[PDB]
Amino acid sequence: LHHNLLNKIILGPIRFFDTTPLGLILNRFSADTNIIDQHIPPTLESLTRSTLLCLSAIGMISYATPVFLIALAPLGVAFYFIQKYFRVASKDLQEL
Amino acid sequence: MLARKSIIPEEYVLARIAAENLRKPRIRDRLPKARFIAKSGACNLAHKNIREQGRFLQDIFTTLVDLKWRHTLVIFTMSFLCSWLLFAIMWWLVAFAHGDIYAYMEKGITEKSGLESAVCVTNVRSFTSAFLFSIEVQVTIGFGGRMMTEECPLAITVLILQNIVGLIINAVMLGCIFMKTAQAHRRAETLIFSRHAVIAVRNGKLCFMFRVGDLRKSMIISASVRIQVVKKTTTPEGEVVPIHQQDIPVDNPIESNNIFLVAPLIICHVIDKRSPLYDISATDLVNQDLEVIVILEGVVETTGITTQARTSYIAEEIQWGHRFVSIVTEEEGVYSVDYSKFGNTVRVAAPRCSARELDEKPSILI
Amino acid sequence: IDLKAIGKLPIAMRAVTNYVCLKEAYEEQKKKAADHPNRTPSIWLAMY
Amino acid sequence: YLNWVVRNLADLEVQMGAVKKVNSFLTMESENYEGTMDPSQVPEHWPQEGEIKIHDLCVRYENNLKPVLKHVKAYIKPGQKVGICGRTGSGKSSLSLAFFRMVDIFDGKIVIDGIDISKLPLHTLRSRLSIILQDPILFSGSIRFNLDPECKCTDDRLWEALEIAQLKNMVKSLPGGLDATVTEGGENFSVGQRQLFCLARAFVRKSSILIMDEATASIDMATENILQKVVMTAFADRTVVTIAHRVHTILTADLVIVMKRGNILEYDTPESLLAQEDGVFASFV
Amino acid sequence: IYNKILRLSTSNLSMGEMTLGQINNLVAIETNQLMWFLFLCPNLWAMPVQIIMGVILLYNLLGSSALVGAAVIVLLAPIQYFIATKLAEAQKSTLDYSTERLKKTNEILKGIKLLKLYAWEHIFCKSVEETRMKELSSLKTFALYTSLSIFMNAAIPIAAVLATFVTHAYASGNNLKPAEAFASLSLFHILVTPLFLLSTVVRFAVKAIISVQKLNEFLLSDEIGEDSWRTEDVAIKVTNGYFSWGSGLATLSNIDIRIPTGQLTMIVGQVGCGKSSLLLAILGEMQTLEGKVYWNNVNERSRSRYSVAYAAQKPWLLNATVEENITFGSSFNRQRYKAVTDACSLQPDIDLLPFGDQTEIGERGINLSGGQRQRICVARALYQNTNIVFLDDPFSALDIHLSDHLMQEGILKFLQDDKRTVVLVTHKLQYLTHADWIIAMKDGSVLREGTLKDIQTKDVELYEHWKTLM
Numbered sequence A: 001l002h003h004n005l006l007n008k009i010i011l012g013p014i015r016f017f018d019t020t021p022l023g024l025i026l027n028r029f030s031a032d033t034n035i036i037d038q039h040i041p042p043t044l045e046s047l048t049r050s051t052l053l054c055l056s057a058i059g060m061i062s063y064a065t066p067v068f069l070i071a072l073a074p075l076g077v078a079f080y081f082i083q084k085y086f087r088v089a090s091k092d093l094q095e096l
Numbered sequence B: 001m002l003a004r005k006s007i008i009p010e011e012y013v014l015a016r017i018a019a020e021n022l023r024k025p026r027i028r029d030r031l032p033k034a035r036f037i038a039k040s041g042a043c044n045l046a047h048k049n050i051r052e053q054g055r056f057l058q059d060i061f062t063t064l065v066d067l068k069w070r071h072t073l074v075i076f077t078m079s080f081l082c083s084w085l086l087f088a089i090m091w092w093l094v095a096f097a098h099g100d101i102y103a104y105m106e107k108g109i110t111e112k113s114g115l116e117s118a119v120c121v122t123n124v125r126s127f128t129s130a131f132l133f134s135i136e137v138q139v140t141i142g143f144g145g146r147m148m149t150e151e152c153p154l155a156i157t158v159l160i161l162q163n164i165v166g167l168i169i170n171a172v173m174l175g176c177i178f179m180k181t182a183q184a185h186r187r188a189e190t191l192i193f194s195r196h197a198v199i200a201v202r203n204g205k206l207c208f209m210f211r212v213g214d215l216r217k218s219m220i221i222s223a224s225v226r227i228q229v230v231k232k233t234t235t236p237e238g239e240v241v242p243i244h245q246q247d248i249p250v251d252n253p254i255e256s257n258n259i260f261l262v263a264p265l266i267i268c269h270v271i272d273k274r275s276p277l278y279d280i281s282a283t284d285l286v287n288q289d290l291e292v293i294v295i296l297e298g299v300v301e302t303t304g305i306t307t308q309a310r311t312s313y314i315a316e317e318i319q320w321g322h323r324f325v326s327i328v329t330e331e332e333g334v335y336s337v338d339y340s341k342f343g344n345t346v347r348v349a350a351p352r353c354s355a356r357e358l359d360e361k362p363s364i365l366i
Numbered sequence C: 001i002d003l004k005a006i007g008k009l010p011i012a013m014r015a016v017t018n019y020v021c022l023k024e025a026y027e028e029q030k031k032k033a034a035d036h037p038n039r040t041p042s043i044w045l046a047m048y
Numbered sequence D: 001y002l003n004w005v006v007r008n009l010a011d012l013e014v015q016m017g018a019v020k021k022v023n024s025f026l027t028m029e030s031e032n033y034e035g036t037m038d039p040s041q042v043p044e045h046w047p048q049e050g051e052i053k054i055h056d057l058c059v060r061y062e063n064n065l066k067p068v069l070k071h072v073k074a075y076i077k078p079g080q081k082v083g084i085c086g087r088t089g090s091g092k093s094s095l096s097l098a099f100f101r102m103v104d105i106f107d108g109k110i111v112i113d114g115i116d117i118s119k120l121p122l123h124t125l126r127s128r129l130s131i132i133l134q135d136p137i138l139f140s141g142s143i144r145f146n147l148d149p150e151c152k153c154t155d156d157r158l159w160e161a162l163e164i165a166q167l168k169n170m171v172k173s174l175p176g177g178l179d180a181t182v183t184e185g186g187e188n189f190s191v192g193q194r195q196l197f198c199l200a201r202a203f204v205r206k207s208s209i210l211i212m213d214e215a216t217a218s219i220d221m222a223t224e225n226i227l228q229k230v231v232m233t234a235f236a237d238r239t240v241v242t243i244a245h246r247v248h249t250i251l252t253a254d255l256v257i258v259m260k261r262g263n264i265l266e267y268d269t270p271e272s273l274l275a276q277e278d279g280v281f282a283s284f285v
Numbered sequence E: 001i002y003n004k005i006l007r008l009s010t011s012n013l014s015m016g017e018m019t020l021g022q023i024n025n026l027v028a029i030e031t032n033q034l035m036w037f038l039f040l041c042p043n044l045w046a047m048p049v050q051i052i053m054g055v056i057l058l059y060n061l062l063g064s065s066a067l068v069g070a071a072v073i074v075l076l077a078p079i080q081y082f083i084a085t086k087l088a089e090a091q092k093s094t095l096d097y098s099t100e101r102l103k104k105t106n107e108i109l110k111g112i113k114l115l116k117l118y119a120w121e122h123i124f125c126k127s128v129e130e131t132r133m134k135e136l137s138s139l140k141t142f143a144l145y146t147s148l149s150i151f152m153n154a155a156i157p158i159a160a161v162l163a164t165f166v167t168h169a170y171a172s173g174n175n176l177k178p179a180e181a182f183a184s185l186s187l188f189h190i191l192v193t194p195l196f197l198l199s200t201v202v203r204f205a206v207k208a209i210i211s212v213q214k215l216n217e218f219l220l221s222d223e224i225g226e227d228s229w230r231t232e233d234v235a236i237k238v239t240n241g242y243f244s245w246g247s248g249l250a251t252l253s254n255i256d257i258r259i260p261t262g263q264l265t266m267i268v269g270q271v272g273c274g275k276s277s278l279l280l281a282i283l284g285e286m287q288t289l290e291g292k293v294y295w296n297n298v299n300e301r302s303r304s305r306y307s308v309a310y311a312a313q314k315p316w317l318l319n320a321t322v323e324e325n326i327t328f329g330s331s332f333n334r335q336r337y338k339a340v341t342d343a344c345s346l347q348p349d350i351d352l353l354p355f356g357d358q359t360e361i362g363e364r365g366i367n368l369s370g371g372q373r374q375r376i377c378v379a380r381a382l383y384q385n386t387n388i389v390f391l392d393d394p395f396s397a398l399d400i401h402l403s404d405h406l407m408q409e410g411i412l413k414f415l416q417d418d419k420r421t422v423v424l425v426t427h428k429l430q431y432l433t434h435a436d437w438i439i440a441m442k443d444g445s446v447l448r449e450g451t452l453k454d455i456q457t458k459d460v461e462l463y464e465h466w467k468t469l470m
């Protein structure tokens, strides 16, 4: 990602450096690069580990006792709403 | 879990468009607007810090009378069920104590006895029977396979108490239903106002005009029109009158404030010296802190209830230079009006000077 | 949710109240320390 | 473990929304990278003799009608020395751009040395000419090598002369080695030193077909640097089609220019052209 | 930290080569580290409780193999501490290389114009690429160690479980019991969660103690006071034998002042020895030892009770809007602001900038040059009404002497319409107009701020020669 970004920024039109802030290029080249280098890998690993553990757990629970999956529909419904609403608000709060 | 432990990145670089774009205004007005009363009634003032007077249970009853029809049935039903249940429990306890349950169970396990000469309240044997006996006593059904013998006076006390309380409940609920049935014409108010206001030229001076109409096939009696201007002023000696409401005449053939409301109308208001609209010009009347209120009063002959209808105008909505299209038109055999041309306005020759000068420079030409 | 709807802070957790308490507590330490010959005032025991 | 999922999902949303910025930026594709595949790469050994103005020179340094040509041409035989007269049309934006086909070589025909420059790769076209504008301010570190990346002969073998192209070091004993140039600093004399570096690069490069932009300090030192440049680079045949704040370079201009707000005509004769026509520019001071 | 920052000394002994970086760090990191320790405070004295209880209700559930299991699991902490330390060292090296790459990137991106024209982008990109290769060769170790951390933290518990259960059949005599095995697995999860957080807590806490040290190194610092609490026509006076700066060595010593209103006394002396110092000291931010301190109004005074504006030899522009810059605490008044903008001839400068008075200025924005910054400083100067105005080397590095003439006309036009005494200082004596006083010195005061007429023929001709010959 970084090599492609750096080899495609420099070979640029004059209008690109003209019409944009002389900080936005640098900001999205430093802060974003650091985030996607040393902060994104762990986030992806954590998400994958947690969701796989949860899925396997709910699978074995469902396999053991059938009545759980009859209760799955309500709980799952609940999950969706939570998994929706947080994600809408949290970002805004973080952006503050 | 501890998202940002690595706190080291700080003040490395941000240096960006946050406000230093220089081609976009940094400021965000956000455009909040405050009017004296909302466009659709609902005077929006702010009372606060008022010495409160507490509450009293008569207010709770007052709420009981004013309910939507889908809640009166619910409170009715709940009241009835709770009363029947409560007295059923009282009767069940009475039956338990006096030794009636045991007597009936023991002499009905073996049918040899057939004895009902010494019982407090005949043929009450379970809570089911008690909750069917209480039904037979409250609603005045009285099925009567369950008499009350005369002996145990506690039962008689319970009967007197329950009959009287049941009558109270019946009377109050009947009263609520009748009161809500009598005041049933009183749906709401449906007075339709034009939204946009013109300042045309007519009869040698300017104007101030809008349109108003009804929908109910009953016209409104002794209708009165009042027009006021809301602005902050001070005395020449300098005192802050926070939101001075000034009354201004609405023109009429004899200078009286009644109007007869059957086909929609123009409500003129000639600008003259005393009027606060003496000093407002064309390019001026987009920037001003003013609010013109209109107050319509009358009675509806059907329901016999006095009604007051409110609306509000600001200088921003008012569009100089227009007038109202003649909504009426002589049809094939009978007059008619299309309310679809309500907010429609057209433009015609409009002087751009101020009425302050429309007599100062005495040429009807501007 | 722009800054207009996040509100000004609650009455007791604003800047001034906290400033005042930390300063008072630190003095309550500095006055004790001044009589003490060879001990300086610090932050940790003052925060308690 | 059912709580980490939502939080980490929000974090992933924020981070991917961040990466969207780089993915969007990378889509920029312009300042066309190409060459017209000429044999011998449009000889750069050739582009050291003469130059001609482009007739109907229509630069594309805008989205609407450019100030280079509203059907505007120039009347130049080869070797037509020029000067500066105007505000924006006669300046270092369109004129300098089409000088060496570096900024918007689209229309007109600026055929450097007779050959169509517009059909040239950026490398050869930009490296067959040296241009310096105001203060360069584009280097970090030491000045020993920063002057050129592949100059083996004309700099090391002429060591005092390489710095002496405009102004010899004379403080190279105090600094370690040939140079240890400060981090974007020493700007006082560096105002002239940027031009000095351009002159050194364009004298080492053995091209000498360059137009050099204005100075800005207007101090005596800028005058001395301009005089030295004229003595060394502009004394040689190909000289500057310059623009400047002070009108002191019209000494040997042959056809002045009035590229401005109105007409794009730049027509001037052989002798009195510098004076009579420039009454506005000569009366500005 | 802020309220202690405001009342700090500007002497060169304390505020010096490392004064703004240390303060910035002490405000941006150490305060944050103390906060994030107080956030994780209780886990310090709760994790031990949980671990002890875990060992207890593991022994009473799985026999004497549970002690072995607890010893197995506990080893999660030392491994995590070691991994964290190595990770931190790797992170420091990576951060250094990242800063280097960022400096190079800003140098090759901001200077794009020359790079665009001379086409030197294809050759100087290899340097950034090589630095990126260095960055990857420094980050690989960080990624490897963090992967080792993730693997060990997820896996050590299962090995501990394996040992604790296996140990029983081969060694213990409990035969078979499915229910007992299930209980052990559940109690294990709780212990595992509590361990890793505790190792991380000890490391953040170690940073906290270190940070606190810095915090109580700052809040004890050199400050000017014990005089800042003390609240005819000439408003400046002294009977001093010394008002110096550092440790002894009386610097602005053996002087005296008299500055009546309406004057324009330009402190002009040997260029190189304390003009800035005397002027700054009268403002009251130097180590007053053996002087007579006086700045008391006439008919109104508390510490001169009025703000003497300034723009010292290093002009400073607030990192805010240009309008706020000019106002610097001034309610909007278009007359004064327009007159000051015209009097510095800032209209062409404002127009050629991005957006005039709407655009941000200074660092963290579209920048200016030295002459522009000088102009901004003098703009902040002229707009400060209701004051005994002043300045110090405002135009010394300014654009031109023509701008000096324009500013002279503006200074006469605006300030003199009021009665604001303006006391500049410069070695440029040519603009010696309106000398209602003149203070001179040679590493210490020379003569009084009298009229030019009395100075020029006070039987002191060397003064006239020195001032005019410039």
Ligand SMILES: COc1ccc(Cl)cc1C(=O)NCCc1ccc(S(=O)(=O)NC(=O)NC2CCCCC2)cc1
Residues within 6 Å of the ligand: B001, B002, B003, E039, E040, E041, E042, E043, E193, E194, E197
């Ligand atoms: C969650 O830890 C533990 C897990 C297990 C155990 Cl046995 C103990 C702990 C523990 O002792 N934890 C410390 C207390 C704690 C917990 C969660 C969180 S948090 O809400 O997840 N993170 C944030 O709030 N960050 C914001 C960012 C913006 C500024 C303000 C802070 C923050 C602090």
Ligand SMILES: Nc1ncnc2c1ncn2[C@@H]1O[C@H](COP(=O)(O)OP(=O)(O)OP(=O)(O)O)[C@@H](O)[C@H]1O
Residues within 6 Å of the ligand: B192, B193, B194, B195, B339, B340, B341, B342, B343, B344
């Ligand atoms: N045919 C109608 N029926 C009900 N209300 C109407 C009608 N015509 C106008 N009004 C009233 O006029 C007010 C102004 O509404 P609005 O500006 O949206 O429409 P308009 O331009 O007045 O009329 P139209 O919608 O016919 O163009 C509204 O409060 C609306 O209730």
